[PDB]
């Protein structure tokens, strides 16, 4: 009955791109109605995003060969961090110019994402595990808010890396929603 288990990989993935387009969207018009970021704008503002952890894999290839239970956890750290806002953190940080209200504001779809995601490491756990992180260690980004003349260059950094510490939450699920199932991707 709704039972099949590629249907999670379905959920998941359906609200994972469903998230890299408002994370984008958002991105997209913010930096203009602000920002000229290479005018010196990158080296000073240092990196950061999740770009250092097996440092993207996306450019047609699947990640390289790796266990199919690092991409989701090596995943959940890349979501629960942003999980640190998306609890009591409102909009007038991330309020969308560009919305539809589409799902369920921001939160609950970045919040389903990490519960769903929760139910396939819980069954992959055993044969092929030593899983990085154990014990209670918390990610959060930095946090974000309120109109100022700096203050928003603190949060743009945000709204760029829910961009580029995303292209991986998804595309890196993509791989193993088509590396452990059959078709409907290629």
Not at 67 to 93: A, D, M, T, Y
Not at 155 to 179: A, S
Request: aromatic residues 10%; proline residues 4%.
């Amino acid at each position: 009955p709704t039972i099949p288990l590629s249907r999670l990989f379905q959920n998941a993935m359906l609200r994972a791109h469903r998230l890299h387009q408002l994370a984008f969207d958002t991105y997209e018009e913010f930096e203009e109605a602000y920002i000229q970021k290479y005018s010196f704008l990158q080296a000073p503002q240092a990196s950061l995003c999740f770009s250092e952890s097996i440092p993207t894999p996306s450019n047609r290839e699947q990640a390289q060969q790796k266990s199919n239970l690092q991409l989701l956890r090596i995943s959940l750290l890349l979501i629960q961090s942003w999980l640190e806002p998306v609890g009591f953190l409102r909009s007038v940080f991330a309020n969308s110019l560009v919305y539809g209200a589409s799902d369920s504001d921001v939160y609950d779809l970045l919040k389903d994402l990490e519960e769903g995601i929760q139910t396939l490491m819980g069954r992959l756990e055993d044969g092929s595990p030593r899983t990085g992180q154990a014990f209670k260690q918390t990610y959060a980004k930095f946090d974000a808010n309120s109109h100022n003349d700096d203050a928003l260059l603190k949060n743009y950094g945000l709204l760029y890396c829910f961009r580029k510490d995303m292209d991986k939450v998804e595309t890196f699920l993509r791989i193993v929603q088509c590396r452990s199932v059959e078709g409907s991707c290629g």
